Amino acid sequence: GTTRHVYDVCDCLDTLAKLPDDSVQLIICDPPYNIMLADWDDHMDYIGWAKRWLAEAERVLSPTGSIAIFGGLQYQGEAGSGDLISIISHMRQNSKMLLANLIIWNYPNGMSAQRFFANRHEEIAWFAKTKKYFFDLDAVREPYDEETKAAYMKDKRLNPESVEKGRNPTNVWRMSRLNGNSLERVGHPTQKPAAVIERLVRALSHPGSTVLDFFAGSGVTARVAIQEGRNSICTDAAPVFKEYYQKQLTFLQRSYEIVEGAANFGAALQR
Ligand SMILES: Nc1ncnc2c1ncn2[C@@H]1O[C@H](CSCC[C@H](N)C(=O)O)[C@@H](O)[C@H]1O
Ligand SMILES: [Cl-]
Ligand SMILES: [Cl-]
Structure with a gap:
Protein backbone atom coordinates (compact mmCIF):
# COMPACT_ATOMS: atom_id res chain seq x y z
CA GLY A 1 0.00 0.00 0.00
CA MET A 44 11.98 28.15 -36.25
CA ASP A 45 9.00 28.21 -33.88
CA TYR A 46 7.58 27.01 -30.56
CA ILE A 47 5.82 23.93 -31.93
CA GLY A 48 8.99 22.72 -33.65
CA TRP A 49 10.49 22.45 -30.17
CA ALA A 50 7.34 21.26 -28.41
CA LYS A 51 6.50 18.53 -30.94
CA ARG A 52 9.36 16.41 -29.62
CA TRP A 53 8.13 16.05 -26.04
CA LEU A 54 4.49 15.89 -27.13
CA ALA A 55 5.36 12.82 -29.20
CA GLU A 56 7.38 11.32 -26.35
CA ALA A 57 4.57 12.09 -23.89
CA GLU A 58 2.12 10.08 -25.99
CA ARG A 59 4.63 7.23 -26.33
CA VAL A 60 5.07 6.70 -22.58
CA LEU A 61 1.32 6.94 -21.87
CA SER A 62 -0.52 3.63 -21.43
CA PRO A 63 -3.51 2.72 -23.66
CA THR A 64 -5.77 3.89 -20.82
CA GLY A 65 -3.64 6.96 -20.11
CA SER A 66 -4.23 10.70 -20.46
CA ILE A 67 -2.34 13.99 -20.48
CA ALA A 68 -3.61 17.31 -19.15
CA ILE A 69 -1.98 20.33 -20.78
CA PHE A 70 -2.26 23.78 -19.20
CA GLY A 71 -2.11 26.88 -21.36
CA GLY A 72 -3.88 30.02 -22.49
CA LEU A 73 -5.40 31.30 -25.72
CA GLN A 74 -3.78 34.75 -25.70
CA TYR A 75 -0.72 34.07 -27.90
CA GLN A 76 0.19 37.33 -29.65
CA GLY A 77 2.37 36.00 -32.47
CA GLU A 78 5.90 36.58 -31.15
CA ALA A 79 8.44 34.30 -32.83
CA GLY A 80 9.54 31.47 -30.58
CA SER A 81 6.33 31.49 -28.58
CA GLY A 82 2.83 30.07 -28.74
CA ASP A 83 -0.04 28.89 -26.58
CA LEU A 84 -2.48 26.03 -25.96
CA ILE A 85 -3.96 26.62 -29.41
CA SER A 86 -0.54 26.13 -31.05
CA ILE A 87 -0.39 22.73 -29.34
CA ILE A 88 -4.00 21.66 -30.05
CA SER A 89 -3.69 22.58 -33.72
CA HIS A 90 -0.52 20.52 -33.94
CA MET A 91 -2.15 17.55 -32.17
CA ARG A 92 -5.15 17.60 -34.53
CA GLN A 93 -2.75 17.29 -37.44
CA ASN A 94 -0.19 14.87 -36.06
CA SER A 95 -1.56 12.90 -33.12
CA LYS A 96 -4.13 10.15 -32.86
CA MET A 97 -4.90 11.14 -29.28
CA LEU A 98 -8.45 12.31 -28.58
CA LEU A 99 -9.36 15.67 -27.10
CA ALA A 100 -11.73 14.42 -24.39
CA ASN A 101 -12.29 17.89 -22.92
CA LEU A 102 -11.15 21.47 -23.08
CA ILE A 103 -11.46 22.54 -19.46
CA ILE A 104 -11.84 26.18 -18.45
CA TRP A 105 -10.18 27.18 -15.18
CA ASN A 106 -12.10 30.33 -14.19
CA TYR A 107 -10.37 32.08 -11.29
CA PRO A 108 -12.07 34.77 -9.11
CA ASN A 109 -9.43 37.48 -8.92
CA GLY A 110 -6.94 39.10 -11.23
CA MET A 111 -5.62 42.32 -12.71
CA SER A 112 -8.02 44.97 -13.99
CA ALA A 113 -8.17 46.25 -17.58
CA GLN A 114 -9.47 49.40 -19.23
CA ARG A 115 -9.19 48.49 -22.92
CA PHE A 116 -10.54 44.92 -22.82
CA PHE A 117 -12.25 42.30 -20.68
CA ALA A 118 -10.14 41.48 -17.62
CA ASN A 119 -8.65 38.01 -17.95
CA ARG A 120 -10.13 35.47 -15.53
CA HIS A 121 -9.34 32.18 -17.25
CA GLU A 122 -6.71 29.71 -18.38
CA GLU A 123 -7.29 26.34 -20.07
CA ILE A 124 -6.56 22.68 -19.58
CA ALA A 125 -6.60 20.43 -22.63
CA TRP A 126 -7.30 16.85 -21.60
CA PHE A 127 -6.00 14.45 -24.23
CA ALA A 128 -6.66 10.71 -23.99
CA LYS A 129 -4.29 8.24 -25.68
CA THR A 130 -7.18 6.01 -26.78
CA LYS A 131 -10.95 5.62 -26.46
CA LYS A 132 -10.43 3.20 -23.55
CA TYR A 133 -9.16 6.05 -21.38
CA PHE A 134 -9.68 5.71 -17.65
CA PHE A 135 -12.19 8.06 -16.04
CA ASP A 136 -13.44 8.19 -12.48
CA LEU A 137 -16.25 10.77 -12.46
CA ASP A 138 -17.64 9.71 -9.07
CA ALA A 139 -14.32 10.62 -7.45
CA VAL A 140 -14.79 14.25 -8.47
CA ARG A 141 -18.56 14.72 -8.34
CA GLU A 142 -19.71 17.68 -6.25
CA PRO A 143 -22.32 16.68 -3.64
CA TYR A 144 -25.47 18.71 -3.11
CA ASP A 145 -26.22 20.06 0.37
CA GLU A 146 -28.60 18.03 2.53
CA GLU A 147 -31.33 20.46 1.52
CA THR A 148 -31.00 20.13 -2.26
CA LYS A 149 -30.45 16.37 -1.98
CA ALA A 150 -33.79 16.05 -0.17
CA ALA A 151 -35.74 18.12 -2.70
CA TYR A 152 -34.40 15.94 -5.53
CA MET A 153 -35.10 12.65 -3.75
CA LYS A 154 -38.78 13.60 -3.62
CA ASP A 155 -38.82 14.28 -7.36
CA LYS A 156 -39.61 10.85 -8.83
CA ARG A 157 -38.56 12.19 -12.23
CA LEU A 158 -34.93 12.21 -11.04
CA ASN A 159 -32.70 9.19 -10.42
CA PRO A 160 -31.94 8.73 -6.67
CA GLU A 161 -28.50 7.24 -7.37
CA SER A 162 -27.42 10.25 -9.42
CA VAL A 163 -28.64 12.58 -6.69
CA GLU A 164 -26.66 10.79 -3.98
CA LYS A 165 -23.42 10.58 -5.98
CA GLY A 166 -23.39 14.30 -6.68
CA ARG A 167 -23.09 16.47 -9.77
CA ASN A 168 -20.64 16.33 -12.66
CA PRO A 169 -18.15 19.18 -11.97
CA THR A 170 -18.55 20.31 -15.62
CA ASN A 171 -15.65 21.48 -17.84
CA VAL A 172 -15.69 24.90 -16.21
CA TRP A 173 -13.90 24.89 -12.87
CA ARG A 174 -14.26 27.96 -10.69
CA MET A 175 -11.15 27.65 -8.55
CA SER A 176 -8.88 30.36 -7.23
CA ARG A 177 -5.16 30.58 -7.83
CA LEU A 178 -2.65 30.73 -4.99
CA ASN A 179 -2.04 34.11 -3.36
CA GLY A 180 1.11 35.46 -1.73
CA ASN A 181 -0.19 34.30 1.65
CA SER A 182 -1.03 30.72 0.61
CA LEU A 183 0.37 27.98 2.85
CA GLU A 184 1.16 25.91 -0.24
CA ARG A 185 3.42 28.59 -1.72
CA VAL A 186 7.00 27.31 -2.02
CA GLY A 187 8.42 30.16 -4.08
CA HIS A 188 7.74 29.10 -7.67
CA PRO A 189 6.40 32.12 -9.64
CA THR A 190 3.61 30.16 -11.39
CA GLN A 191 2.89 27.54 -8.72
CA LYS A 192 -0.39 25.74 -9.40
CA PRO A 193 -2.89 25.21 -6.54
CA ALA A 194 -3.10 21.64 -5.26
CA ALA A 195 -6.90 21.74 -5.70
CA VAL A 196 -6.78 21.74 -9.52
CA ILE A 197 -4.12 19.02 -9.76
CA GLU A 198 -6.13 16.90 -7.28
CA ARG A 199 -9.23 16.90 -9.47
CA LEU A 200 -7.12 15.81 -12.45
CA VAL A 201 -5.32 13.07 -10.51
CA ARG A 202 -8.58 11.70 -9.06
CA ALA A 203 -10.49 11.75 -12.34
CA LEU A 204 -7.76 10.68 -14.78
CA SER A 205 -5.76 8.10 -12.85
CA HIS A 206 -6.45 5.18 -10.57
CA PRO A 207 -4.85 4.40 -7.19
CA GLY A 208 -1.38 2.92 -7.42
CA SER A 209 -0.88 4.15 -11.00
CA THR A 210 1.97 6.40 -12.15
CA VAL A 211 1.61 10.18 -12.60
CA LEU A 212 4.36 11.91 -14.60
CA ASP A 213 5.31 15.61 -14.65
CA PHE A 214 8.42 16.73 -16.60
CA PHE A 215 7.78 20.45 -16.03
CA ALA A 216 7.16 19.83 -12.31
CA GLY A 217 7.95 23.42 -11.33
CA SER A 218 6.95 23.60 -7.65
CA GLY A 219 6.56 19.84 -7.34
CA VAL A 220 2.85 20.12 -6.52
CA THR A 221 2.17 16.95 -8.53
CA ALA A 222 4.22 14.79 -6.15
CA ARG A 223 2.39 16.16 -3.11
CA VAL A 224 -0.99 15.45 -4.72
CA ALA A 225 0.16 12.03 -5.89
CA ILE A 226 1.29 11.14 -2.38
CA GLN A 227 -1.99 12.37 -0.87
CA GLU A 228 -4.10 10.45 -3.40
CA GLY A 229 -2.21 7.16 -3.25
CA ARG A 230 -0.62 7.41 -6.69
CA ASN A 231 3.01 6.83 -7.64
CA SER A 232 4.84 9.76 -9.19
CA ILE A 233 7.78 10.90 -11.27
CA CYS A 234 8.54 14.62 -11.21
CA THR A 235 11.40 16.34 -13.02
CA ASP A 236 12.17 19.96 -13.91
CA ALA A 237 15.24 21.50 -15.58
CA ALA A 238 15.69 24.17 -12.89
CA PRO A 239 18.17 23.27 -10.12
CA VAL A 240 15.93 25.07 -7.60
CA PHE A 241 13.31 22.37 -8.25
CA LYS A 242 14.96 20.16 -5.63
CA GLU A 243 14.33 22.84 -2.97
CA TYR A 244 10.69 23.26 -3.93
CA TYR A 245 10.20 19.49 -3.94
CA GLN A 246 11.64 19.08 -0.47
CA LYS A 247 9.43 21.94 0.67
CA GLN A 248 6.37 20.16 -0.73
CA LEU A 249 7.30 17.21 1.48
CA THR A 250 7.29 19.27 4.69
CA PHE A 251 3.65 20.03 3.89
CA LEU A 252 3.11 16.29 4.28
CA GLN A 253 4.71 16.54 7.72
CA ARG A 254 0.31 7.47 5.00
CA SER A 255 2.90 5.21 3.38
CA TYR A 256 5.20 6.56 0.69
CA GLU A 257 8.83 6.39 -0.33
CA ILE A 258 10.81 9.28 -1.83
CA VAL A 259 13.71 8.44 -4.16
CA GLU A 260 16.04 10.93 -5.86
CA GLY A 261 17.74 10.31 -9.23
CA ALA A 262 16.49 9.58 -12.74
CA ALA A 263 18.31 6.25 -12.49
CA ASN A 264 15.53 5.20 -10.13
CA PHE A 265 12.51 6.07 -12.30
CA GLY A 266 11.66 2.37 -12.24
CA ALA A 267 10.76 2.52 -8.54
CA ALA A 268 7.78 4.70 -9.41
CA LEU A 269 6.81 2.70 -12.50
CA GLN A 270 6.22 -0.54 -10.60
CA ARG A 271 2.47 -0.98 -10.14
N1 LIG B 1 13.53 21.87 -21.23
C1 LIG B 1 12.95 21.74 -20.04
N2 LIG B 1 12.91 20.53 -19.42
C2 LIG B 1 12.35 20.38 -18.21
N3 LIG B 1 11.80 21.43 -17.58
C3 LIG B 1 11.80 22.66 -18.15
C4 LIG B 1 12.38 22.84 -19.40
N4 LIG B 1 12.24 24.13 -19.73
C5 LIG B 1 11.60 24.73 -18.72
N5 LIG B 1 11.32 23.84 -17.76
C6 LIG B 1 10.53 24.08 -16.51
O1 LIG B 1 9.11 24.04 -16.80
C7 LIG B 1 8.41 24.88 -15.84
C8 LIG B 1 7.44 25.79 -16.60
S1 LIG B 1 6.34 26.75 -15.49
C9 LIG B 1 5.16 27.40 -16.74
C10 LIG B 1 3.80 27.79 -16.15
C11 LIG B 1 2.81 28.30 -17.22
N6 LIG B 1 2.69 27.29 -18.30
C12 LIG B 1 3.28 29.63 -17.82
O2 LIG B 1 3.60 29.64 -19.03
O3 LIG B 1 3.29 30.63 -17.06
C13 LIG B 1 9.49 25.68 -15.09
O4 LIG B 1 9.61 25.16 -13.76
C14 LIG B 1 10.77 25.44 -15.87
O5 LIG B 1 11.87 25.33 -14.97
CL1 LIG C 1 -15.05 20.07 -23.95
CL1 LIG D 1 3.62 24.32 -10.28
Whole structure:
Protein backbone atom coordinates (compact mmCIF):
# COMPACT_ATOMS: atom_id res chain seq x y z
CA GLY A 1 0.00 0.00 0.00
CA THR A 2 3.10 2.19 -0.12
CA THR A 3 3.62 4.52 -3.07
CA ARG A 4 6.93 5.48 -4.69
CA HIS A 5 7.99 8.94 -5.82
CA VAL A 6 11.07 9.77 -7.82
CA TYR A 7 12.37 13.22 -8.62
CA ASP A 8 15.36 14.85 -10.24
CA VAL A 9 16.57 17.87 -12.16
CA CYS A 10 16.47 17.01 -15.87
CA ASP A 11 15.51 18.33 -19.28
CA CYS A 12 12.10 16.93 -20.28
CA LEU A 13 13.44 14.99 -23.27
CA ASP A 14 16.14 13.37 -21.15
CA THR A 15 13.51 12.22 -18.65
CA LEU A 16 11.16 10.89 -21.33
CA ALA A 17 13.95 9.02 -23.11
CA LYS A 18 14.46 6.90 -19.98
CA LEU A 19 10.80 5.88 -19.71
CA PRO A 20 9.48 2.77 -21.52
CA ASP A 21 6.42 2.67 -23.80
CA ASP A 22 2.94 2.60 -22.21
CA SER A 23 4.25 2.81 -18.64
CA VAL A 24 2.53 5.99 -17.43
CA GLN A 25 -1.15 6.48 -16.56
CA LEU A 26 -1.34 10.27 -16.28
CA ILE A 27 0.84 13.20 -17.22
CA ILE A 28 0.48 16.68 -15.73
CA CYS A 29 1.83 19.14 -18.29
CA ASP A 30 2.19 22.88 -17.60
CA PRO A 31 4.99 23.80 -20.09
CA PRO A 32 6.78 27.05 -20.79
CA TYR A 33 5.30 28.69 -23.89
CA ASN A 34 8.45 30.11 -25.42
CA ILE A 35 11.73 28.56 -26.55
CA MET A 36 15.14 29.69 -25.35
CA LEU A 37 17.71 31.63 -27.38
CA ALA A 38 19.83 28.51 -28.00
CA ASP A 39 16.76 26.66 -29.32
CA TRP A 40 17.00 28.82 -32.42
CA ASP A 41 19.88 26.58 -33.51
CA ASP A 42 17.38 23.80 -34.27
CA HIS A 43 13.90 25.35 -34.56
CA MET A 44 11.98 28.15 -36.25
CA ASP A 45 9.00 28.21 -33.88
CA TYR A 46 7.58 27.01 -30.56
CA ILE A 47 5.82 23.93 -31.93
CA GLY A 48 8.99 22.72 -33.65
CA TRP A 49 10.49 22.45 -30.17
CA ALA A 50 7.34 21.26 -28.41
CA LYS A 51 6.50 18.53 -30.94
CA ARG A 52 9.36 16.41 -29.62
CA TRP A 53 8.13 16.05 -26.04
CA LEU A 54 4.49 15.89 -27.13
CA ALA A 55 5.36 12.82 -29.20
CA GLU A 56 7.38 11.32 -26.35
CA ALA A 57 4.57 12.09 -23.89
CA GLU A 58 2.12 10.08 -25.99
CA ARG A 59 4.63 7.23 -26.33
CA VAL A 60 5.07 6.70 -22.58
CA LEU A 61 1.32 6.94 -21.87
CA SER A 62 -0.52 3.63 -21.43
CA PRO A 63 -3.51 2.72 -23.66
CA THR A 64 -5.77 3.89 -20.82
CA GLY A 65 -3.64 6.96 -20.11
CA SER A 66 -4.23 10.70 -20.46
CA ILE A 67 -2.34 13.99 -20.48
CA ALA A 68 -3.61 17.31 -19.15
CA ILE A 69 -1.98 20.33 -20.78
CA PHE A 70 -2.26 23.78 -19.20
CA GLY A 71 -2.11 26.88 -21.36
CA GLY A 72 -3.88 30.02 -22.49
CA LEU A 73 -5.40 31.30 -25.72
CA GLN A 74 -3.78 34.75 -25.70
CA TYR A 75 -0.72 34.07 -27.90
CA GLN A 76 0.19 37.33 -29.65
CA GLY A 77 2.37 36.00 -32.47
CA GLU A 78 5.90 36.58 -31.15
CA ALA A 79 8.44 34.30 -32.83
CA GLY A 80 9.54 31.47 -30.58
CA SER A 81 6.33 31.49 -28.58
CA GLY A 82 2.83 30.07 -28.74
CA ASP A 83 -0.04 28.89 -26.58
CA LEU A 84 -2.48 26.03 -25.96
CA ILE A 85 -3.96 26.62 -29.41
CA SER A 86 -0.54 26.13 -31.05
CA ILE A 87 -0.39 22.73 -29.34
CA ILE A 88 -4.00 21.66 -30.05
CA SER A 89 -3.69 22.58 -33.72
CA HIS A 90 -0.52 20.52 -33.94
CA MET A 91 -2.15 17.55 -32.17
CA ARG A 92 -5.15 17.60 -34.53
CA GLN A 93 -2.75 17.29 -37.44
CA ASN A 94 -0.19 14.87 -36.06
CA SER A 95 -1.56 12.90 -33.12
CA LYS A 96 -4.13 10.15 -32.86
CA MET A 97 -4.90 11.14 -29.28
CA LEU A 98 -8.45 12.31 -28.58
CA LEU A 99 -9.36 15.67 -27.10
CA ALA A 100 -11.73 14.42 -24.39
CA ASN A 101 -12.29 17.89 -22.92
CA LEU A 102 -11.15 21.47 -23.08
CA ILE A 103 -11.46 22.54 -19.46
CA ILE A 104 -11.84 26.18 -18.45
CA TRP A 105 -10.18 27.18 -15.18
CA ASN A 106 -12.10 30.33 -14.19
CA TYR A 107 -10.37 32.08 -11.29
CA PRO A 108 -12.07 34.77 -9.11
CA ASN A 109 -9.43 37.48 -8.92
CA GLY A 110 -6.94 39.10 -11.23
CA MET A 111 -5.62 42.32 -12.71
CA SER A 112 -8.02 44.97 -13.99
CA ALA A 113 -8.17 46.25 -17.58
CA GLN A 114 -9.47 49.40 -19.23
CA ARG A 115 -9.19 48.49 -22.92
CA PHE A 116 -10.54 44.92 -22.82
CA PHE A 117 -12.25 42.30 -20.68
CA ALA A 118 -10.14 41.48 -17.62
CA ASN A 119 -8.65 38.01 -17.95
CA ARG A 120 -10.13 35.47 -15.53
CA HIS A 121 -9.34 32.18 -17.25
CA GLU A 122 -6.71 29.71 -18.38
CA GLU A 123 -7.29 26.34 -20.07
CA ILE A 124 -6.56 22.68 -19.58
CA ALA A 125 -6.60 20.43 -22.63
CA TRP A 126 -7.30 16.85 -21.60
CA PHE A 127 -6.00 14.45 -24.23
CA ALA A 128 -6.66 10.71 -23.99
CA LYS A 129 -4.29 8.24 -25.68
CA THR A 130 -7.18 6.01 -26.78
CA LYS A 131 -10.95 5.62 -26.46
CA LYS A 132 -10.43 3.20 -23.55
CA TYR A 133 -9.16 6.05 -21.38
CA PHE A 134 -9.68 5.71 -17.65
CA PHE A 135 -12.19 8.06 -16.04
CA ASP A 136 -13.44 8.19 -12.48
CA LEU A 137 -16.25 10.77 -12.46
CA ASP A 138 -17.64 9.71 -9.07
CA ALA A 139 -14.32 10.62 -7.45
CA VAL A 140 -14.79 14.25 -8.47
CA ARG A 141 -18.56 14.72 -8.34
CA GLU A 142 -19.71 17.68 -6.25
CA PRO A 143 -22.32 16.68 -3.64
CA TYR A 144 -25.47 18.71 -3.11
CA ASP A 145 -26.22 20.06 0.37
CA GLU A 146 -28.60 18.03 2.53
CA GLU A 147 -31.33 20.46 1.52
CA THR A 148 -31.00 20.13 -2.26
CA LYS A 149 -30.45 16.37 -1.98
CA ALA A 150 -33.79 16.05 -0.17
CA ALA A 151 -35.74 18.12 -2.70
CA TYR A 152 -34.40 15.94 -5.53
CA MET A 153 -35.10 12.65 -3.75
CA LYS A 154 -38.78 13.60 -3.62
CA ASP A 155 -38.82 14.28 -7.36
CA LYS A 156 -39.61 10.85 -8.83
CA ARG A 157 -38.56 12.19 -12.23
CA LEU A 158 -34.93 12.21 -11.04
CA ASN A 159 -32.70 9.19 -10.42
CA PRO A 160 -31.94 8.73 -6.67
CA GLU A 161 -28.50 7.24 -7.37
CA SER A 162 -27.42 10.25 -9.42
CA VAL A 163 -28.64 12.58 -6.69
CA GLU A 164 -26.66 10.79 -3.98
CA LYS A 165 -23.42 10.58 -5.98
CA GLY A 166 -23.39 14.30 -6.68
CA ARG A 167 -23.09 16.47 -9.77
CA ASN A 168 -20.64 16.33 -12.66
CA PRO A 169 -18.15 19.18 -11.97
CA THR A 170 -18.55 20.31 -15.62
CA ASN A 171 -15.65 21.48 -17.84
CA VAL A 172 -15.69 24.90 -16.21
CA TRP A 173 -13.90 24.89 -12.87
CA ARG A 174 -14.26 27.96 -10.69
CA MET A 175 -11.15 27.65 -8.55
CA SER A 176 -8.88 30.36 -7.23
CA ARG A 177 -5.16 30.58 -7.83
CA LEU A 178 -2.65 30.73 -4.99
CA ASN A 179 -2.04 34.11 -3.36
CA GLY A 180 1.11 35.46 -1.73
CA ASN A 181 -0.19 34.30 1.65
CA SER A 182 -1.03 30.72 0.61
CA LEU A 183 0.37 27.98 2.85
CA GLU A 184 1.16 25.91 -0.24
CA ARG A 185 3.42 28.59 -1.72
CA VAL A 186 7.00 27.31 -2.02
CA GLY A 187 8.42 30.16 -4.08
CA HIS A 188 7.74 29.10 -7.67
CA PRO A 189 6.40 32.12 -9.64
CA THR A 190 3.61 30.16 -11.39
CA GLN A 191 2.89 27.54 -8.72
CA LYS A 192 -0.39 25.74 -9.40
CA PRO A 193 -2.89 25.21 -6.54
CA ALA A 194 -3.10 21.64 -5.26
CA ALA A 195 -6.90 21.74 -5.70
CA VAL A 196 -6.78 21.74 -9.52
CA ILE A 197 -4.12 19.02 -9.76
CA GLU A 198 -6.13 16.90 -7.28
CA ARG A 199 -9.23 16.90 -9.47
CA LEU A 200 -7.12 15.81 -12.45
CA VAL A 201 -5.32 13.07 -10.51
CA ARG A 202 -8.58 11.70 -9.06
CA ALA A 203 -10.49 11.75 -12.34
CA LEU A 204 -7.76 10.68 -14.78
CA SER A 205 -5.76 8.10 -12.85
CA HIS A 206 -6.45 5.18 -10.57
CA PRO A 207 -4.85 4.40 -7.19
CA GLY A 208 -1.38 2.92 -7.42
CA SER A 209 -0.88 4.15 -11.00
CA THR A 210 1.97 6.40 -12.15
CA VAL A 211 1.61 10.18 -12.60
CA LEU A 212 4.36 11.91 -14.60
CA ASP A 213 5.31 15.61 -14.65
CA PHE A 214 8.42 16.73 -16.60
CA PHE A 215 7.78 20.45 -16.03
CA ALA A 216 7.16 19.83 -12.31
CA GLY A 217 7.95 23.42 -11.33
CA SER A 218 6.95 23.60 -7.65
CA GLY A 219 6.56 19.84 -7.34
CA VAL A 220 2.85 20.12 -6.52
CA THR A 221 2.17 16.95 -8.53
CA ALA A 222 4.22 14.79 -6.15
CA ARG A 223 2.39 16.16 -3.11
CA VAL A 224 -0.99 15.45 -4.72
CA ALA A 225 0.16 12.03 -5.89
CA ILE A 226 1.29 11.14 -2.38
CA GLN A 227 -1.99 12.37 -0.87
CA GLU A 228 -4.10 10.45 -3.40
CA GLY A 229 -2.21 7.16 -3.25
CA ARG A 230 -0.62 7.41 -6.69
CA ASN A 231 3.01 6.83 -7.64
CA SER A 232 4.84 9.76 -9.19
CA ILE A 233 7.78 10.90 -11.27
CA CYS A 234 8.54 14.62 -11.21
CA THR A 235 11.40 16.34 -13.02
CA ASP A 236 12.17 19.96 -13.91
CA ALA A 237 15.24 21.50 -15.58
CA ALA A 238 15.69 24.17 -12.89
CA PRO A 239 18.17 23.27 -10.12
CA VAL A 240 15.93 25.07 -7.60
CA PHE A 241 13.31 22.37 -8.25
CA LYS A 242 14.96 20.16 -5.63
CA GLU A 243 14.33 22.84 -2.97
CA TYR A 244 10.69 23.26 -3.93
CA TYR A 245 10.20 19.49 -3.94
CA GLN A 246 11.64 19.08 -0.47
CA LYS A 247 9.43 21.94 0.67
CA GLN A 248 6.37 20.16 -0.73
CA LEU A 249 7.30 17.21 1.48
CA THR A 250 7.29 19.27 4.69
CA PHE A 251 3.65 20.03 3.89
CA LEU A 252 3.11 16.29 4.28
CA GLN A 253 4.71 16.54 7.72
CA ARG A 254 0.31 7.47 5.00
CA SER A 255 2.90 5.21 3.38
CA TYR A 256 5.20 6.56 0.69
CA GLU A 257 8.83 6.39 -0.33
CA ILE A 258 10.81 9.28 -1.83
CA VAL A 259 13.71 8.44 -4.16
CA GLU A 260 16.04 10.93 -5.86
CA GLY A 261 17.74 10.31 -9.23
CA ALA A 262 16.49 9.58 -12.74
CA ALA A 263 18.31 6.25 -12.49
CA ASN A 264 15.53 5.20 -10.13
CA PHE A 265 12.51 6.07 -12.30
CA GLY A 266 11.66 2.37 -12.24
CA ALA A 267 10.76 2.52 -8.54
CA ALA A 268 7.78 4.70 -9.41
CA LEU A 269 6.81 2.70 -12.50
CA GLN A 270 6.22 -0.54 -10.60
CA ARG A 271 2.47 -0.98 -10.14
N1 LIG B 1 13.53 21.87 -21.23
C1 LIG B 1 12.95 21.74 -20.04
N2 LIG B 1 12.91 20.53 -19.42
C2 LIG B 1 12.35 20.38 -18.21
N3 LIG B 1 11.80 21.43 -17.58
C3 LIG B 1 11.80 22.66 -18.15
C4 LIG B 1 12.38 22.84 -19.40
N4 LIG B 1 12.24 24.13 -19.73
C5 LIG B 1 11.60 24.73 -18.72
N5 LIG B 1 11.32 23.84 -17.76
C6 LIG B 1 10.53 24.08 -16.51
O1 LIG B 1 9.11 24.04 -16.80
C7 LIG B 1 8.41 24.88 -15.84
C8 LIG B 1 7.44 25.79 -16.60
S1 LIG B 1 6.34 26.75 -15.49
C9 LIG B 1 5.16 27.40 -16.74
C10 LIG B 1 3.80 27.79 -16.15
C11 LIG B 1 2.81 28.30 -17.22
N6 LIG B 1 2.69 27.29 -18.30
C12 LIG B 1 3.28 29.63 -17.82
O2 LIG B 1 3.60 29.64 -19.03
O3 LIG B 1 3.29 30.63 -17.06
C13 LIG B 1 9.49 25.68 -15.09
O4 LIG B 1 9.61 25.16 -13.76
C14 LIG B 1 10.77 25.44 -15.87
O5 LIG B 1 11.87 25.33 -14.97
CL1 LIG C 1 -15.05 20.07 -23.95
CL1 LIG D 1 3.62 24.32 -10.28
